[PDB]
């Protein structure tokens, strides 16, 4: 449930990971602006059915996208890359958040605009400006029990958000004395987080300009504080109980990851439904990547001289695992 009443207002190098989900996916993270080209290669030909999940970003304002005898490759193209990079393949508590991003396309009449809604670590709504639907599409397996009037309201509110973002695009362009030829992006995130007894504890409303943290005068006057706090402490938590109860079958299912150890020392875990995991080796830290089915995998290593890989132990810690 989006907030109806809407008060107006550095380049990061991409990192690429390549793997095949079950024992073909390319995970990119830390790349901004959104103008990315990514492709999967080498059955002598390109891949035809290349689709990607929704565009979003973590707390650090930086994006993270995913695409999913023969040898393959992944090619990545971004303005931070003078030369398109190729990477090879080797086989051997609760919270609600809403992320809004609007991108200026210099020349095109309608700037790009998408909105994403997340509960825990799973998205449940989709809206893309360039999409032909032009309506808030669910695409989630636990939200379809709602009625059409709900979706009409969501469409109306998301279009209000679109118009607001279109406006402050030019507003900040004038504020920082930039030109029309350059392309800039505005990002907004708001949400509210509940605990084990299903009541509000925390809330977030942050806003950034092209990946620079901006605000988390007009507003002071505009009396935003009370209404915003009421919305965060109000409609979120009731609706959030509602999605939690209607999404109980999936959202809370605890998944036990399966562990493996290899040396040819890598300790690896797969299929843990929540993202939070810890791996310890009694050391290089890599980012967690999904499997495409909602389950997650991670991995960590220790490098040892020849013959002495036997005196290190990996312990896997998790909310859904009893003992490391």
């Amino acid at each position: 449930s989006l907030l109806m009443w809407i008060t107006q207002v550095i380049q990061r190098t991409p990192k690429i990971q390549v793997y095949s989900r079950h024992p073909l996916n390319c995970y990119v993270s830390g790349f901004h602006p959104s103008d990315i080209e990514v492709d999967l290669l080498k059955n002598g030909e390109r891949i035809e059915k290349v689709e990607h999940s929704d565009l979003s970003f973590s707390k650090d304002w930086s994006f993270y996208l995913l695409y999913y005898k023969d040898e393959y490759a992944c090619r990545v193209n971004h303005v931070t890359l003078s030369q398109p990079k190729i990477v090879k393949w080797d086989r051997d508590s609760h919270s609600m958040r809403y992320f809004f991003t609007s991108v200026s396309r210099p020349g095109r009449g309608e700037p790009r605009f998408i909105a994403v809604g997340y509960v825990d670590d799973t998205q449940f709504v989709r809206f893309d400006s360039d999409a032909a639907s032009q309506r808030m599409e669910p695409r989630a397996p636990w939200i379809e029990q709602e009625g059409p009037e709900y979706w009409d309201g969501e469409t109306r509110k998301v279009k209000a958000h679109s118009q607001t973002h279109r406006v402050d695009l030019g507003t900040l362009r004038g504020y920082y004395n930039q030109s029309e030829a350059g392309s800039h992006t505005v990002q907004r995130m708001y949400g509210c987080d509940v605990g084990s007894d299903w009541r509000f504890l925390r809330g977030y409303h942050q806003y950034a300009y092209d990946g620079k943290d901006y605000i988390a005068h007009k507003w002071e006057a505009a009396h935003v504080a009370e209404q915003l706090r009421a919305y965060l402490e109000g409609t979120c938590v009731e609706w959030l109980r509602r999605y939690l109860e209607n999404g109980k079958e999936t959202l809370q299912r605890t998944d036990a990851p399966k562990t493996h150890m290899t040396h040819h020392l890598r300790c690896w875990a797969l299929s843990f439904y929540p993202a939070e995991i810890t791996l310890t080796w009694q050391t290089e830290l890599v980012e967690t990547r999904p499997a495409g089915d909602g389950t997650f995998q991670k991995w960590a290593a220790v490098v040892v001289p020849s013959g002495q890989e036997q005196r290190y132990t990996c312990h896997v810690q998790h909310e859904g695992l009893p003992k490391p």
Epitope: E110, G153, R156, K159, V167, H223, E226
Partner: T-cell receptor
């Protein structure tokens, strides 16, 4: 959702305190507006009450909003002949996505010199 | 403020006339009202963002169209004797405070 104004007709001698009443059926609102209207010349905004405010003041004009009972009262002090006009009460919603206000019928006020 | 033109207009039945509403404080909510004598202040098409327009309670017989967040034209393609009324342009922010702003109004009269 429905706004009614009382008493849609008022006629007083100059210098008398005035009480005007606007009531609404739906209590989940975020706005309140009172507009003067001379026979023509459009609408002039007088007042604005938020969902967080119980009182509002502007010069010799005062107003109170009791959301639980769903009532709003406007107090005019020491009426002058210049206050002869129609007064309109308007409210805007909190949920729905529509942002369409619901205007009342209005109360006409004449103050004899 | 919000300026709407023209102030007065006389139309032969069957003509076409487009009233213009403009503002400079870059509001977002726009709407048209028609006020009838002793009947009420009824609503016409309203638009919340650029490119999106929805119907009100009296949609028949009217065009609107919004491509620029500063202007709003209300066009009558074929004026009718029942169109005789006074029209107001209501402009507002979204979410800022909720205050409305009305234009000076425009009088229309349609004669056979």
């Amino acid at each position: 959702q429905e706004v009614t104004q009382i008493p849609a007709a008022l006629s007083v001698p100059e210098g008398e305190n005035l009480v005007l009443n606007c009531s609404f059926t739906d209590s989940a609102i975020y706005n309140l507006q009172w507009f003067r209207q001379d026979p023509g010349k459009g609408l002039t905004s007088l007042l604005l009450i938020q969902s967080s405010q119980r009182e509002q003041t502007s010069g010799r004009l005062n107003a109170s909003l009791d959301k639980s009972s769903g009532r709003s009262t406007l107090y005019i002090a020491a009426s002058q002949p210049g206050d002869s006009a129609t007064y309109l009460c308007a409210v805007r919603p909190l949920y729905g996505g529509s942002y369409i206000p619901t205007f009342g019928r209005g109360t006409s006020l004449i103050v004899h010199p | 403020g919000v300026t709407q033109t023209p102030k007065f207009q006389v139309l032969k039945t069957g003509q076409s006339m487009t009233l213009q509403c403009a503002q400079d404080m870059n509001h977002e909510y726009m709407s048209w009202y028609r006020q009838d004598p002793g009947m009420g202040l009824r609503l016409i098409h309203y638009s919340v963002g650029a490119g999106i327009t929805d119907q009100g309670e009296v949609p028949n017989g009217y065009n609107v169209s919004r491509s620029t967040t500063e202007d709003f034209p209300l066009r009558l393609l074929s004026a009718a004797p029942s169109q005789t009324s006074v029209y107001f342009c209501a402009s507002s922010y979204v979410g800022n405070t909720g205050e409305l702003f009305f234009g000076e109004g425009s009088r229309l009269t349609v004669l056979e």
